[PDB]
Design an enzyme around this catalytic site. Structure first.
Site, mmCIF file in Angstrom:
data_model
loop_
_atom_site.group_PDB
_atom_site.id
_atom_site.type_symbol
_atom_site.label_atom_id
_atom_site.label_comp_id
_atom_site.label_asym_id
_atom_site.label_seq_id
_atom_site.Cartn_x
_atom_site.Cartn_y
_atom_site.Cartn_z
ATOM 1 N N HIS A 62 32.936 41.805 40.875
ATOM 2 C CA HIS A 62 33.997 41.981 39.839
ATOM 3 C C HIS A 62 35.085 40.948 40.071
ATOM 4 C CE1 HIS A 62 36.517 44.943 42.171
ATOM 5 N NE2 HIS A 62 35.390 45.614 42.315
ATOM 6 N N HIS A 92 42.836 39.103 45.875
ATOM 7 C CA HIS A 92 41.826 38.752 44.910
ATOM 8 C C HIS A 92 42.664 38.267 43.670
ATOM 9 C CE1 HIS A 92 42.906 42.867 43.943
ATOM 10 N NE2 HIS A 92 42.811 42.466 42.712
ATOM 11 N N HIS A 94 42.235 37.355 39.221
ATOM 12 C CA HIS A 94 41.696 37.664 37.916
ATOM 13 C C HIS A 94 41.791 36.310 37.115
ATOM 14 C CE1 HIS A 94 41.818 42.027 38.348
ATOM 15 N NE2 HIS A 94 42.725 41.616 39.149
ATOM 16 N N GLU A 104 46.681 38.998 33.873
ATOM 17 C CA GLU A 104 46.569 40.412 33.406
ATOM 18 C C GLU A 104 47.940 40.759 32.804
ATOM 19 O OE1 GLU A 104 45.001 43.082 36.696
ATOM 20 O OE2 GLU A 104 43.216 42.873 35.506
ATOM 21 N N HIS A 117 46.413 38.562 43.084
ATOM 22 C CA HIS A 117 46.999 39.896 43.503
ATOM 23 C C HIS A 117 46.886 40.173 44.993
ATOM 24 C CE1 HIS A 117 46.280 42.060 39.250
ATOM 25 N NE2 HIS A 117 47.430 41.418 39.244
ATOM 26 N N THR A 196 44.202 47.974 38.271
ATOM 27 C CA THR A 196 43.810 47.429 37.011
ATOM 28 C C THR A 196 42.294 47.444 36.825
ATOM 29 O OG1 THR A 196 43.705 45.024 37.373
ATOM 30 C CG2 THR A 196 45.997 45.958 36.856
HETATM 31 BR BR BR Z 1 44.366 45.249 40.946
HETATM 32 ZN ZN ZN Z 2 43.788 42.845 40.703
#
Ligand code: BR
Ligand code: ZN
EC number: 4.2.1.1
Length: 258
Positions: A62, A92, A94, A104, A117, A196
């Site tokens: 993911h 990590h 996004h 995000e 994050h 999230t």
């Molecule tokens: Br998160």
């Molecule tokens: Zn995240």
């Protein structure tokens, strides 16, 4: 089947398996800089990462997580809107299939190419799985990534992606210092939110840094080469692994600056 970011299992579907998805303190949200209240009682953040110990990088299907040793107060966050000490467990990102999408959080509806994050759990709870079950369980510092100048400090990360291409791969990842990922300024917005990705628990105090950092196009490109799929499965590029903005509802965003 199981959750993801594709058409059939995308964020619009998470509610069926994780009803919390429609809860009251869901993240991410759009930060409206004119409606955010500057609060002069918020203290400055405290980032103590001089003793950080990275251990492993892992593709989880993911995103990719860089994990740290959280057995002791080595990399902690304290200060700001927080009470007690929050230990660094992993970081990590996004990101998107394109440069003008990937973040995000949003600022006055503007989206950034990625959102780094850093996740920390409240030591008062003894372990991360205990922290997740509490309103003030975790602290997530968020940092936007804009495509610009390269970022030296992120290059060791970029370089090992080749070895954790598919879901389930891991690689030793020691001696990384997450101090190379921080913007010059620590001004931020704070609000009470949630993870999230499922289980989307509402255990987070979000701390989103005002200033973003730059990454070169090339650095971002290599993010775009990872896969969602496991080795020996048809290729699905890891991209657009971002949730859309959620309704703010009964919450206030507070700033640490004017
Ligand atoms: Br998160
Ligand atoms: Zn995240």
């Amino acid at each position: 089947h199981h959750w993801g970011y594709g058409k059939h299992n995308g964020p619009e579907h998470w509610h069926k398996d994780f009803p919390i998805a429609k809860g009251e303190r869901q993240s991410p949200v759009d930060i409206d800089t004119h409606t955010a209240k500057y609060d002069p009682s918020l203290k400055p953040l405290s980032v103590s990462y001089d003793q950080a110990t990275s251990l492993r990088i892992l593709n989880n299907g993911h995103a990719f997580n860089v994990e740290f040793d959280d057995s002791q107060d080595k990399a902690v966050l304290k200060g700001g809107p927080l009470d007690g000490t929050y230990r660094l467990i992993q970081f990590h990102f996004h990101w998107g299939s394109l440069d003008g999408q990937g973040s995000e959080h949003t600022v006055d509806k503007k989206k950034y190419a990625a959102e780094l994050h850093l996740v920390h759990w409240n030591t008062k709870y003894g372990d991360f799985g205990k922290a997740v079950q509490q309103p003030d369980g975790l602290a997530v510092l968020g940092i936007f990534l804009k495509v610009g100048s390269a970022k030296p400090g992120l290059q060791k990360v970029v370089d090992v992606l080749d070895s954790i291409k598919t879901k389930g791969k891991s690689a030793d990842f020691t001696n990384f210092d997450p101090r190379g990922l921080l913007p010059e300024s620590l001004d931020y917005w704070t609000y009470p939110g949630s993870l999230t990705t499922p289980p989307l628990l509402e255990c987070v105090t979000w701390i989103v840094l005002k200033e973003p950092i730059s990454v070169s196009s090339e650095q971002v490109l290599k993010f775009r080469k990872l896969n969602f799929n496991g080795e020996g499965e048809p290729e699905e590029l890891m991209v657009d692994n971002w949730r859309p903005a959620q309704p703010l509802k009964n919450r206030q965003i507070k700033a640490s600056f004017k």
